[PDB]
Write a protein that binds this DNA or RNA. Structure first.
Lengths: 81, 110, 98, 98, 98, 110, 81, 98
DNA sequence: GCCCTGGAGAATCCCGGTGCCGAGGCCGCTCAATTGGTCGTAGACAGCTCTAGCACCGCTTAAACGCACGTACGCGCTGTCCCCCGCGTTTTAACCGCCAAGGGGATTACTCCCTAGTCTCCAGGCACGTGTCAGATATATACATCCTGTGCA
DNA sequence: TGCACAGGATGTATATATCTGACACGTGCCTGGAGACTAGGGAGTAATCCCCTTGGCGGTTAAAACGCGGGGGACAGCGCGTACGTGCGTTTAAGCGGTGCTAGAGCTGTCTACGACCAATTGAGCGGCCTCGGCACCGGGATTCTCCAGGGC
């Protein structure tokens, strides 16, 4: 059982993401907000991917499941089949 | 004797597979029937869009002194061309990065 | 021992088009995967729109006309007019040949 | 007197660096643990393909970066240079995610 | 004396359902048109998702479990679980009948 | 002699038409084949969603002292229920209006 | 041939729309911006609708043509068939 | 001596009134002339069903009302009570329209 | 002098009578759903192969973390002024009701040509090998840039 | 005394050399696309009908346009304090490379039961057709809300 892995999304990593997003200056309260945002996003995507996986009667979440879930949420991904 | 086989892609003057596109249309549950010109038209369009993206991406690869197109070159091409950026507006290119855009209010004062 | 089951892609066709537009440029496996998914995505969009068009008009057949209207609904502006010209040219050449 | 860049010089340097590069910006093992932990709530004993985790990370990072761009716009709109949670919340509200 | 063509709609079934949930309550024709387009919209959403599920899994048949996975994908949460309950109850009752 | 005809809706205990849903699935270019339980399941789901919207809309109509649901009541039902508002998030209901919502900063400083 | 009909979307009409949108105070420059926005929106929708009309070989834009155009642009509209 | 409401009382009154109501807020005939003028550029001698014109007006007004909601949020974010063109532009940029 | 009541005045709501037109029920009827068999293949299932996912472990070092310091940015406060609101008046054209013409949507009938289906045959395309060169990686260097102190008009 | 270079430190762009593994190309083979037909119905076409779109017209009035105070909100400036950026030393786990094991993904062969299909039958649903009551409307009175002018602390 895994626990408290959202803290693995560290402040330096969030800062790097913000830099690629063009942000020059980051308030200290951004990091928890961003961890919550990322958690919500991943919950939606992973719920749909596991739905696709269970429908196929597999136990392994595949890249194709993830791609289909992203497509269903209007976030088409290229480069994984 | 039967005639020597000639692909439908060659009759239409295309590089994209007219016969394979016809099969994918018939077996894609799009309609009860598929006309003979539908796969030809669709292969021509797919080939045109491919050539557009590949032309822009080859320019972008050459502008980095590279000889091989990579996802970064594809992303640069797409996000720099206005209509391709509209067509792929909600598409994410893996390993594509972003465009180098800094808001001018963030730049240092001279 | 046994060869993997064959999996069709558009890779050789994308590569032919690439050798047409940039005779000296190559392409990585990841960029080719992106190109293949792009072709599949555009195919799906155009075929879905042509299917819906045939349904709205109570037709049983997807024809060049449905495909052309799907292209005009899906592509923005100049891309649409050029794609339409390519399609009509290819169909004219195909029917003039056989 | 040791050298110090002024507060924003290194930030702009980082912006240029990371908008130039394409590599992923989150650590892969922490992200994988996060994914597996989230998926535990939907079904037990799930396995993941390496490419499934990589696709999740590509999508997550693209989403977070685009969100940060919208957030930066909302912070500039209020005549700030510092992004704040209110900026993030406004961006996600206008997008139609809240 | 040209009788208009037959136009099918869900209006009568919407009216039966309404008389079940609110016996002393009617519905205007505009609201009924909205309810009809809602039934059609949701039918198309679920049917399209079941169609592409069957295609993803290389099946030829849309079955009750494709419909169930489509419902779980498209509906938000509690709606989805109550809808799955209603659907499986109906399929069980239908199978027991004949 | 033939047995008395029973609608599949009656066998399933449904008000929505199972036979019509079956035919709409078969003639809709969705799959090559349509299983027997798919129309039963789909009709049950449609009847349930209709019942949810109509229950909330009848409540909204009674709140305005009307005995007849109008688009306004449909809109108030949809936008006030969280999950229905998520389902119909990208949908415009004609003649539905909007939810009464004034931002608190715009109210007079009392 | 019609011309200059965007000015038929009057300043009070735009004010009524903004009131339904909850807006309390309206810059004088909002009205030209709103006209431009409405014109862009109508151009997109009507281009799609007339494409449907031309494909049907019709000369009359129908409510279904408008509804299909809107649904294609992700703005589904109930109440018109 | 003549009675005057203060600047904002009548604006809040109108907000409440027009959020209670559901009728269209643009004049039908000007909107219809606008629609026909816009369609002239796509195809000449076009005719419109009355219901087509009305569907267009419903869509347009719904779009503008939602846009003004997002614009109001943008203006309040910048500590104002007055919506401005830059608020509209920010909302449309965050949505992904400009 | 600043603030709390307290009437005016306006707006909104609540009641009640009118009247109409659309919801709602009813009646033929027809066409689509149900019944009842037939069949052939899609899929369920069992068995088997072997891919790749999981688990672990040692090591190297890149990245995270914690801390200190200062500075520049967020934010509150103040003042001005102008621009937007509220409102009374005049003007305009929307709206409504009605009439009339005919363009074209919608239907019907028919006929043919275009597409599905089949079968045969072979070549295009896929999996698999393989070699070399484009690019990834140091590595040292030549800039290009930032920042502070300093000299000076 | 506040402003522009000097130069120093820092970072980055840029040859240059190594090296390697992924890309591109060649080979074998097999399955799916083409060629050559036939059958039948989807649709192209013509004729016809009627409906519903457009165009006009005149009267009424709601609404738009306009102008005019005036207040309050936008915005600019200023000050202050704290919180974020930069940099530095310490810690820690990520990454990487290997080894090992087996769960389950993926394929294959059987066979059956489920769905398509088809023909006959009939009632569920649709159009049409009234018809009355729910709602719109109108007017009038009660209630609530806004606001400022003066009384009081």
């Amino acid at each position: 059982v895994l626990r408290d892995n959202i803290q693995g999304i560290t402040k330096p990593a969030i800062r790097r993401l913000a830099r690629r997003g063009g942000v020059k200056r980051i308030s200290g309260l951004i990091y928890e907000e961003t961890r919550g945002v990322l958690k919500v996003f991943l919950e939606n995507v992973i719920r749909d991917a596991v739905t696709y996986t269970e429908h196929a009667k597999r136990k392994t979440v595949t890249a194709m499941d993830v791609v289909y879930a992203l497509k269903r949420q209007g976030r088409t991904l290229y480069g994984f089949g | 004797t039967r005639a020597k086989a000639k692909t439908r892609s060659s009759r239409a003057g295309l590089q994209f597979p007219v016969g394979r596109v016809h099969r994918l249309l018939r077996k894609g549950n799009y309609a009860e029937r598929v006309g003979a010109g539908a796969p030809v038209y669709l292969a021509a369009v797919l080939e045109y869009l491919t050539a557009e993206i590949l032309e822009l991406a080859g320019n972008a690869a050459r502008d980095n002194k590279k000889t091989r197109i990579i996802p970064r070159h594809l992303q640069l091409a797409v996000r720099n061309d206005e209509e391709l950026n509209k067509l792929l507006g909600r598409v994410t290119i893996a390993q594509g990065g972003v465009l180098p855009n800094i808001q001018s209010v963030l730049l240092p004062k001279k | 021992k046994r060869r993997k089951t064959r999996k069709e892609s558009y890779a050789i066709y994308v590569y032919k088009v690439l050798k047409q537009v940039h005779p000296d440029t190559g392409i990585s496996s990841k960029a080719m995967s992106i190109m293949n998914s792009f072709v599949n995505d555009v195919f799906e969009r155009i075929a879905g729109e042509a299917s819906r068009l045939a349904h709205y008009n109570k037709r049983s057949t997807i024809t060049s006309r449905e495909i052309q209207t799907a292209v005009r609904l899906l592509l923005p502006g100049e891309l649409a007019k050029h794609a339409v010209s390519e399609g009509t040219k290819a169909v004219t050449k195909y029917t003039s040949a056989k | 007197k040791p050298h110090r860049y002024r507060p924003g010089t290194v930030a702009l340097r980082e912006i240029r660096r990371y908008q130039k590069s394409t590599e992923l910006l989150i650590r892969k093992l922490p992200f994988q643990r996060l994914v597996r932990e989230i998926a535990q709530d939907f079904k037990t004993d799930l396995r993941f393909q390496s490419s499934a985790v990589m696709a999740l990370q590509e999508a997550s990072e693209a989403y977070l970066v685009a969100l940060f761009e919208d957030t930066n716009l909302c912070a500039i709109h209020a005549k700030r240079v510092t992004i704040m949670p209110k900026d993030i919340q406004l961006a996600r509200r206008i997008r139609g995610e809240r």
